Amino acid sequence: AQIANLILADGQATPANHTFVPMQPQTGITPSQWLNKEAASNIGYRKVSMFVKYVSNGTSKVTIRIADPVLASVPAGCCVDTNTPQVAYSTFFECTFSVPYGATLQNKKDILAYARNLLGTQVVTDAVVDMTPAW
Amino acid sequence: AQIANLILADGQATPANHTFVPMQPQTGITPSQWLNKEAASNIGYRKVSMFVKYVSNGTSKVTIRIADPVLASVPAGCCVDTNTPQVAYSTFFECTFSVPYGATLQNKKDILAYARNLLGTQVVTDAVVDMTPAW
Amino acid sequence: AQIANLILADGQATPANHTFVPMQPQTGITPSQWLNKEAASNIGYRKVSMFVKYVSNGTSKVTIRIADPVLASVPAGCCVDTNTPQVAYSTFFECTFSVPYGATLQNKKDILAYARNLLGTQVVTDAVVDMTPAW
Amino acid sequence: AQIANLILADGQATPANHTFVPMQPQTGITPSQWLNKEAASNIGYRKVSMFVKYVSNGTSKVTIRIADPVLASVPAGCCVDTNTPQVAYSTFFECTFSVPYGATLQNKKDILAYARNLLGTQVVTDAVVDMTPAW
Amino acid sequence: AQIANLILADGQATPANHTFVPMQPQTGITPSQWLNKEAASNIGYRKVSMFVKYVSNGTSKVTIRIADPVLASVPAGCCVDTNTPQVAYSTFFECTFSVPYGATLQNKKDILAYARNLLGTQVVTDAVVDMTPAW
Amino acid sequence: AQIANLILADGQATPANHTFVPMQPQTGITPSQWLNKEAASNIGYRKVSMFVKYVSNGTSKVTIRIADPVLASVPAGCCVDTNTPQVAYSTFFECTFSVPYGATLQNKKDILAYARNLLGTQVVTDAVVDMTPAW
């Protein structure tokens, strides 16, 4: 997988696809990372990043983080320098897969599928969106 | 979501549903958690735990961790006992959603969808199974 | 040479081509490296790494190292874990070309050819396989 | 393999064979080594040397080094004592095979072939001759 | 922009394309750099290098330098060996684009075009080649 | 080269020629400089300046800088009088040619052409406009 564009669909009544241009690939410590480039200021750009640490005799790790910021919009007549905008708040998602040495390709398939199916579960969607726990 | 059984499909040619009995609900200090209860050994049970920390003025946090013990993959010569480190004989997935107070319902839906679509992406599938990163 | 797949033939009666997926390109500090990705275990993957340090006034250096884990050869009684030293359960080949600044293109071609012909020589083949030196 | 002459072909449009007389064989610490005996002075002679350390319970090692020097030629009318010549620069190739105890003859064949095929690869010839990396 | 070959036309009656093989991609402090690979010795290789510092809130900076070295041809008198070359002199071009936070994309286009056209201008060609100012 | 008008094409879908009336000829330390004269206030005038330091025995130096300022449009809130304009920001381009004593006239031509073509290159256009490095 050479680095290339990334297309992720937001959650709406009808999802609309959002595109992520690559900015830096994975070499050494630095992780591969993409930018959305949709917001008004350079700071509102939504970003994704990933790093695949392959440990030949040890615990390999895949780390992913997704950042969705929302900029601070002030009334139009008001005066805050547009050259200095701030981020009001930003949602974050951070996950890490930990795969032992000597794990079967089937074990890797297994855990990937468990993670994806769990995040697709009604209890998980319920918890993240409505803030509703499993009581 | 009252705590109840949880059904997650493994990754195979034909995926097979695996069931998760609940063990305890979510409390203020303990996270809700389930158990696979398939393998004969206490070790081979697969666990899934989740916790929804609501912060009425601050960053709420949903935390999820999935553990799949792969003892089949362990060589016959290696002995597994209480002192064997967990991260050496089982696969793990850990994610955390961070949701600031004042996030629109649409922001919550958005980040849930971004996470799920990203883990569905081919680049992620390729990186977790074939260990191949984005270079 | 943009980094791309690498195909190396093993030594058998009928040699069998083995493919090497690229993992990361060559950077100023990290060397370009590939992976075999054949054996089921993370350990059994065979790696090949290379780095070309250009010294515009001095001794440039090309460095290559090849690692073939032979876990089949390990006795059943011996356990292999993170603490097992690498050089005990895998074969290794490490070479370094040192090219001074001001070397004619013909000097570079020359030493490449001398190295390749020497490793092709029967004395080298005999010494590496049958452990028999030149006495 | 008793020590005997060595014939290595340089890299040219049409390679021309160069011969290496043996000077010292491998006994104890001292490695087997051959000399080209083609250059004008005794210091320009190109040399090859090899050592096969057989470790019965441990990591056996085959070490090879090839030295191609180019002497310093000064204008004929100029006066530098011909009894005291210097080497302007010299190219070097150094490789080490590391073979574990208990490695199959097939594993030894394998790694020898991987090394030879890799040094024969277009990316390797490109890197050593043109100073071109894998980017 | 993944790093790839770079083709630049020299200044002649009829310009001739010169190719620049990459040596180093930009990562951290280390800047992207390409080499000409035409002169025989490792020194004569011409070098182009660039570094893009993106400052998310501030003055971002693109820095570029072009180095055209010419090897010295010594006379008989000084008696430096024909084989050890030295660089006589080298022409240098070093530019820096400063792009502030609030800059329009059209502004970025504008200034790049002004720079290119100004290096095209008769006044600049006159000044750089004949050392004649604009009096 | 007596100082005279200077015409430079802006970067647009269709470039439009912009004229630069001279203000100052190069004399002593004071460098030649031209002004755009398009924005209404004396501040918005864009400025091009150049200085040719001919060093009869040493490294001669041509220095150039292009300043593209954009006037600020204030909102109603801060209540700076409509009549007093302020400069919001300005893009800057600054280059320096270094020509050593022994440089061939062909070498001067060469480096000027390399600079112009490199500012033409897709990598540089990409980097300056989208702040994307050559990774």
Burial class for D7, CB neighbours closer than 10 Å (0-12, 13-18, 19+): exposed
**E95: Cβ contacts below 8 Å, ≥ 6 apart:** E63, E64, E65, E115, F93, F94, F95, F96, F115, F119
Residue B101: how many other CB atoms lie within 10 Å: 12
- Under DSSP, is residue B61 helix (H, G, I), strand (E, B) or coil? strand
Rounded to whole angstroms, the Cα distance separating F47 from F41 reads 14
**Mind spelling out the 3-state secondary structure of A27-40?**
ECCECEEEECCCCC
CA A48 to chain centre: 5
Of all helices (H) and strands (E), which one includes residue B56? Answer: none
Q: Is B36 exposed, middle or buried (0-12, 13-18, 19+ CB in 10 A)?
A: buried
Going by C-alpha positions, the residue among F83, B41, D13, F91 that lies closest to residue E100 is F91
A77 contacts F135? CB cut-off 8 A = no
C19 touches chain B (CB under 8 A): no
The verdict on A131 touching B (C-beta cutoff 8 Å) is: yes
How far from the centroid of its chain's Cα atoms is residue D49's Cα? Answer: 7
Place of tokens 């984005």: B134
| Relative orientation angle of helices D105-119 and C105-120, to the nearest 10 degrees | 160
**Contact (CB, 8 A) for E50 and E67:** no
Count of other CB atoms within 10 angstroms of residue D40? 11
Let me know: does F53 contact F61? Beta carbons within 8 Å.
Answer: yes
Residue type, B85: P
Residues 6 or more apart from B52 whose CB is under 8 A from it?
A: A127, A131, A132, A133, A134, B26, B60, B61, B62
Sheet holding A32-35, edge to edge: A6-9, A17-24, A32-35, A47-53, A60-71, A87-99, B90-100, B59-69, B47-53, B32-35, B17-24, B6-9
Q: How far apart are CA A53 and CA A28, in angstroms?
A: 9
Alpha helices (runs of H) in chain A, residue ranges in sequence order: 105-119, 122-130
Residue with tokens 């996470």: B115
Asked if C24 and C49 count as a contact pair (C-beta separation under 8 A), the reply is no
* C-alpha distance across the termini of chain F, in Å: 42
CA distance C57 to D55: 41
- Taking an 8 Å cut-off on Cβ atoms, the answer to whether D78 and E83 are in contact is no
Closest by CA to D86, choosing from D67, D105, D72, is D72
Encoded tokens for B80:
């597994």
- Secondary structure of F68-93 as H, E, C letters: EEEECCCCCCCCCCCCCCCEEEEEEE
Q: Please report, for residues B31, B97, D84, F26, F129, the alpha-carbon distance to residue B64 in angstroms, rounded to integers and kept in the order given.
A: 9, 9, 76, 70, 41
CA gap D45, D37 in Å, rounded: 5
Place of tokens 């095929």: D117
Can you tell me the distance from the alpha carbon of B115 to that of E116, in angstroms, rounded to the nearest whole number? 44
Calpha distance C81→C42 (Å, rounded): 12
Q: What is the CB neighbour count within 10 angstroms for residue D126?
A: 16
Partner-chain residue, chosen from F6, F111, F134, that has the shortest CB–CB distance to E32 = F134
Q: Which helix (H) or strand (E) holds E19?
A: strand E17-24
Bridge partners for A73 per DSSP: none
CA-based torsion, D111, D113, D119, D122: positive or negative: negative
Asked whether the beta carbons of C22 and C37 are under 8 A apart, the reply is: no
Contact flag for F and E (3+ C-beta pairs < 8 Å): yes
- With CA atoms as reference, report the closest residue to A49 among A62, A58, A38, A40: A62
Tell me how long chain B is.
Answer: 135
Angle at D36 between CA D35 and CA D40, to 5 degrees: 115
Distance, first Cα to last Cα, chain E: 42
Tell me the two tokens of residue A19.
Answer: 């595109």
Chain E: residue nearest F1 by CA?
A: E134
Q: Contact D32/D70 with Cβ under 8 angstroms?
A: no
Q: What are the E-state strand segments in chain A?
A: 6-9, 17-24, 32-35, 47-53, 60-71, 87-99
Edge-to-edge strand list for the sheet holding D47-53:
C6-9, C17-24, C32-35, C47-53, C59-69, C90-100, D87-99, D60-71, D47-53, D32-35, D17-24, D6-9
DSSP code for D115: H
Q: Are E7 and E20 in contact (CB under 8 A)?
A: yes
Q: Provide the token pair at D24.
A: 């010292």
How far is residue F20 CA from its own chain's centroid? 11
What's the half-sphere exposure (Cβ side, CA atoms, 13 Å) at F27? Answer: 6
Query: B132 contacts in C (CB within 8 Å)?
Result: 21, 23
Report d(CA B33, CA E125) in Å as an integer. 75
Query: What phi and psi values does residue D119 have, to the nearest 5 degrees?
Result: -65, -25
Q: Which two tokens stand for residue B102?
A: 């004042």
> Which one-letter DSSP state was computed for residue B86?
G
**Does D72 touch chain C if contact means CB atoms closer than 8 Å?**
no
**Interface contact flag, B78 C79, Cβ < 8 Å:** yes
Tokens linked to B127: 């990186």
Q: Is C42 on the interface with A (CB under 8 A)?
A: yes
Residues in chain D within 8 Å Cβ distance of C89: 100
Neighbours of E85 (CB within 10 A): 20
N-to-C CA span, chain C: 41
Between CA F119 and CA E48 the distance in angstroms is 12
Chain B interface includes A38 (CB < 8 A):
no
Non-local CB neighbours of E49 within 8 Å, separated by 6+ positions: E24, E31, E32, E33, E34, E64, E65
Burial of F15 (0-12, 13-18, 19+ CB in 10 A): middle
Chain D contact set for E23 (CB, 8 A): 131, 133
**Which residues on C lie below 8 Å from B133 (Cβ)?**
23-24
Closest of D9, E106, B44 to residue C119, by C-alpha: D9
DSSP element (H, E) containing D104 = none
Name D44's Cβ contacts closer than 8 Å, sequence gap at least 6: D38, D69, D70, D71, D85, D87
Q: Does an interface of 3+ CB pairs under 8 Å exist between D and B? A: no
Establish if C30 touches chain A: CB-CB under 8 angstroms: yes
Q: Please list, residue by residue across F65-89, b when 16 or more beta carbons sit within 10 angstroms of its beta carbon and e when fewer do.
A: bbbbbbebebbeeeeeeeeebeebb
Question: Do residues B100 and B58 touch, judged by C-beta distance below 8 A?
Answer: yes
- Paired with A60 in beta bridges are A99
- The number of helix segments (H) and strand segments (E) in chain B equals 2, 6
Cβ-based neighbours of D120, under 8 Å, separated by 6 or more: C116
Which residues, 6 or more positions from B112, have their beta carbon under 8 angstroms from its beta carbon? A11, A119, A125, A128, A129, B97
**Using an 8 Å Cβ cutoff, are B80 and B89 in contact?**
yes
In contact, E38 and E50? CB cutoff 8 Å: no
Which two structure tokens, joined as six digits, stand for B96?
């955390």
Question: Using CA atoms in the order C104, C109, C112, C113, what is the torsion angle rounded to 10 degrees?
Answer: -130
Q: Does E28 touch chain A (CB under 8 A)?
A: yes
> Is C76's CB within 8 Å of B76's CB?
yes
Distant-in-sequence, close-in-space partners of F94: CB < 8 Å, separation ≥ 6: E95, E96, E98, F63, F64, F65, F66
What is the Cα–Cα distance from E123 to E120, expressed in whole angstroms? 9
Q: Which of D64, D86, D130 to mutate to test the interface with C (most CBs of C within 10 A)?
A: D64
**Spatial separation of the C-alpha atoms in residues F37 and C58, rounded to whole Å:** 53
Count of CB atoms situated within 10 Å of the CB of D101:
13
Q: How far is E83 from chain F (nearest CA, A)?
A: 23
- A48 and A37 in contact (C-beta within 8 Å)? no
Please name the residues in contact with F79: beta carbons below 8 A apart, sequence gap of 6 or more.
Answer: none
Phi and psi torsions of D24, nearest 5°:
-140, 135
B44 exposed, middle or buried (CB, 10 Å; 0-12, 13-18, 19+)? middle
Q: Are D8 and D17 in contact (CB under 8 A)?
A: yes
- Report d(CA D82, CA D80) in Å as an integer: 6
Residue E96: both structure tokens together: 């820096």
Instruction: Check if B79 contacts C (Cβ < 8 Å).
Output: yes
Query: Cα dist. A22→A19, A62, B98, C4, E49 in Å?
Result: 10, 18, 24, 20, 22
Q: Judge whether C133 and D26 are in contact, CB under 8 Å.
A: yes
Residue A71 sits at the chain F interface (C-beta within 8 Å)? no
List, in sequence order, the alpha helices (H) in B95-135. 105-120, 122-129
Other beta carbons less than 10 A from residue F121's beta carbon? 18
Angle separating helix axes C105-120 and C122-129, nearest 10 degrees: 50
Question: Angle at the Cα of F101 (from F98 to F104), degrees rounded to 5?
Answer: 85
In angstroms, how far is CA B113 from the centroid of its own chain? Answer: 17
DSSP codes of every residue in F12-79: SSS--EEEEEEEE--BTTBPEEEE---SSSTTT--EEEEEEE--TTS-EEEEEEEEEEEE----TTT-
Give the list of residues 6+ apart from residue A95 with CB closer than 8 angstroms, or none.
Answer: A63, A64, A65, A115, B93, B94, B95, B96, B115, B119
Within 10 A of F3 (CB to CB), how many other CB atoms are there?
A: 17
With contact defined as beta carbons under 8 Å apart, do A72 and A88 qualify?
A: yes
Contact between C11 and D106 using a beta-carbon 8 Å cutoff: yes
Query: Quick one: three-class SS letters along D19-73?
Result: EEEEEECCECCECEEEECCCCCCCCCCCEEEEEEECCCCCCEEEEEEEEEEEECC
| A84 part of contact set with chain F, CB < 8 Å | no
Query: Which element (helix H / strand E) includes B16?
Result: none
Q: What's the CA gap between C13 and C16, in Å, rounded? A: 9
| B86 touching A (Cβ < 8 Å) | no
Q: What's the CA gap between C8 and B129, in Å, rounded?
A: 23
Do residues F70 and F81 make contact, with C-beta atoms less than 8 angstroms apart? no
Residues in chain F within 8 Å Cβ distance of A77: 75-77
SS (H, E, C) chain C: CCCCCEEEECCCCCCCEEEEEEEECCCCCCCEEEECCCCCCCCCCCEEEEEEECCCCCEEEEEEEEEEECCCCCCCCCCCCCCCCHHHCEEEEEEEEEEECCCCHHHHHHHHHHHHHHHHCHHHHHHHHCCCCCC
Q: How far is A130 from chain F (nearest CA, A)?
A: 39
Length of chain A: 135
Please say whether the beta carbons of E49 and E65 come within 8 A: yes
Q: Distance between CA atoms of E99 and F90, rounded to whole angstroms? A: 8
